[PDB]
Protein backbone atom coordinates (compact mmCIF):
# COMPACT_ATOMS: atom_id res chain seq x y z
CA UNK A 1 0.00 0.00 0.00
CA UNK A 2 3.00 2.29 0.54
CA UNK A 3 4.49 1.50 -2.89
CA UNK A 4 1.83 0.81 -5.57
CA UNK A 5 4.58 -0.17 -8.02
CA UNK A 6 6.03 -3.72 -8.05
CA UNK A 7 2.56 -5.30 -8.04
CA UNK A 8 3.68 -8.74 -6.75
CA UNK A 9 3.26 -7.80 -3.07
CA UNK A 10 -0.54 -8.16 -2.99
CA UNK A 11 -0.56 -11.61 -4.62
CA UNK A 12 2.03 -13.19 -2.30
CA UNK A 13 0.24 -11.74 0.75
CA UNK A 14 -2.96 -13.42 -0.43
CA UNK A 15 -1.26 -16.82 -0.30
CA UNK A 16 -0.16 -16.32 3.33
CA UNK A 17 -3.75 -15.52 4.31
CA UNK A 18 -5.14 -18.67 2.65
CA UNK A 19 -2.44 -20.91 4.14
CA UNK A 20 -3.25 -19.34 7.52
CA UNK A 21 -6.88 -20.44 7.48
CA UNK A 22 -6.11 -23.96 6.25
CA UNK A 23 -3.62 -24.33 9.12
CA UNK A 24 -6.35 -23.14 11.49
CA UNK A 25 -8.85 -25.77 10.28
CA UNK A 26 -6.55 -28.76 10.88
CA UNK A 27 -5.84 -27.15 14.23
CA UNK A 28 -9.53 -27.19 15.13
CA UNK A 29 -10.21 -30.64 13.63
CA UNK A 30 -7.35 -32.20 15.61
CA UNK A 31 -8.49 -30.30 18.71
CA UNK A 32 -12.14 -31.43 18.62
CA UNK A 33 -11.18 -35.03 17.79
CA UNK A 34 -8.72 -35.15 20.70
CA UNK A 35 -11.45 -33.93 23.05
CA UNK A 36 -14.20 -36.30 21.85
CA UNK A 37 -12.34 -39.60 22.28
CA UNK A 38 -11.32 -38.68 25.84
CA UNK A 39 -14.98 -38.63 26.84
CA UNK A 40 -15.33 -41.99 25.10
CA UNK A 41 -12.86 -44.19 27.00
CA UNK A 42 -14.24 -43.52 30.49
CA UNK A 43 -16.45 -46.15 32.10
CA UNK A 44 -20.14 -45.28 32.32
CA UNK A 45 -21.96 -45.16 35.67
CA UNK A 46 -25.63 -44.71 36.52
CA UNK A 47 -24.92 -42.18 39.28
CA UNK A 48 -22.29 -40.04 37.50
CA UNK A 49 -22.86 -37.35 34.86
Amino acid sequence: HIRPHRTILAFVSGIFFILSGLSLVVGLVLYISSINDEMLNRTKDAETY
Binding site: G14, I18, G21, L22, V25, L28, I32, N36
Partner: protein
Protein backbone atom coordinates in the same frame (compact mmCIF):
# COMPACT_ATOMS: atom_id res chain seq x y z
CA UNK B 1 -47.46 -45.61 33.95
CA UNK B 2 -49.41 -44.86 30.77
CA UNK B 3 -47.18 -44.17 27.73
CA UNK B 4 -47.42 -40.57 26.55
CA UNK B 5 -46.42 -39.04 23.23
CA UNK B 6 -43.39 -36.75 23.18
CA UNK B 7 -43.18 -34.19 20.40
CA UNK B 8 -39.84 -34.31 18.57
CA UNK B 9 -37.82 -31.19 17.93
CA UNK B 10 -38.23 -29.34 14.66
CA UNK B 11 -34.52 -29.85 13.87
CA UNK B 12 -34.49 -33.55 14.80
CA UNK B 13 -33.45 -34.46 11.24
CA UNK B 14 -29.99 -33.03 12.05
CA UNK B 15 -29.49 -35.69 14.79
CA UNK B 16 -27.69 -38.62 12.99
CA UNK B 17 -24.63 -36.37 12.66
CA UNK B 18 -23.19 -34.41 15.55
CA UNK B 19 -23.18 -30.61 15.52
CA UNK B 20 -19.38 -30.63 15.39
CA UNK B 21 -19.59 -32.32 11.98
CA UNK B 22 -22.12 -29.81 10.58
CA UNK B 23 -19.76 -26.96 11.48
CA UNK B 24 -16.81 -28.59 9.71
CA UNK B 25 -18.82 -29.19 6.52
CA UNK B 26 -19.35 -25.43 6.20
CA UNK B 27 -15.66 -24.78 6.93
CA UNK B 28 -14.70 -27.34 4.28
CA UNK B 29 -17.19 -25.73 1.87
CA UNK B 30 -15.58 -22.28 2.14
CA UNK B 31 -12.06 -23.72 2.03
CA UNK B 32 -12.48 -25.59 -1.26
CA UNK B 33 -14.18 -22.69 -3.09
CA UNK B 34 -11.41 -20.25 -2.10
CA UNK B 35 -8.65 -22.68 -3.18
CA UNK B 36 -10.45 -23.54 -6.44
CA UNK B 37 -10.69 -19.85 -7.36
CA UNK B 38 -7.01 -19.19 -6.61
CA UNK B 39 -5.74 -22.29 -8.42
CA UNK B 40 -7.79 -21.50 -11.54
CA UNK B 41 -7.31 -17.72 -11.88
CA UNK B 42 -3.53 -17.53 -11.96
CA UNK B 43 -1.59 -14.74 -13.73
CA UNK B 44 -1.49 -16.32 -17.24
CA UNK B 45 -4.90 -17.93 -16.41
CA UNK B 46 -7.29 -19.98 -21.92
CA UNK B 47 -10.67 -18.21 -21.58
CA UNK B 48 -11.33 -19.31 -18.00
CA UNK B 49 -14.71 -18.87 -16.30
CA UNK B 50 -14.13 -19.95 -12.66
CA UNK B 51 -14.81 -16.81 -10.69
CA UNK B 52 -15.69 -16.81 -7.00
CA UNK B 53 -19.42 -16.80 -7.79
CA UNK B 54 -18.94 -19.78 -10.09
CA UNK B 55 -16.66 -21.56 -7.61
CA UNK B 56 -19.21 -21.38 -4.79
CA UNK B 57 -21.86 -22.59 -7.24
CA UNK B 58 -19.71 -25.51 -8.41
CA UNK B 59 -19.00 -26.67 -4.86
CA UNK B 60 -22.67 -26.40 -3.88
CA UNK B 61 -23.76 -28.57 -6.80
CA UNK B 62 -21.08 -31.18 -6.12
CA UNK B 63 -22.11 -31.68 -2.49
CA UNK B 64 -25.81 -32.07 -3.30
CA UNK B 65 -25.04 -34.56 -6.14
CA UNK B 66 -27.23 -32.60 -8.56
CA UNK B 67 -24.61 -32.00 -11.26
CA UNK B 68 -22.92 -28.89 -12.61
CA UNK B 69 -23.12 -26.63 -15.65
CA UNK B 70 -19.35 -26.50 -16.17
CA UNK B 71 -16.32 -28.58 -15.21
CA UNK B 72 -12.65 -27.73 -14.55
CA UNK B 73 -10.36 -28.18 -17.55
CA UNK B 74 -6.98 -27.52 -15.90
CA UNK B 75 -5.23 -30.37 -14.10
CA UNK B 76 -4.97 -28.51 -10.79
CA UNK B 77 -8.67 -27.73 -11.17
CA UNK B 78 -9.50 -31.39 -11.70
CA UNK B 79 -7.53 -32.41 -8.58
CA UNK B 80 -9.44 -30.03 -6.29
CA UNK B 81 -12.71 -31.14 -7.88
CA UNK B 82 -12.11 -34.87 -7.51
Amino acid sequence: KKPQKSKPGVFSFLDPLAYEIWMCIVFAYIGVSVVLFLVSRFSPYSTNEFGIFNSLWFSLGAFMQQGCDISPRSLSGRIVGG
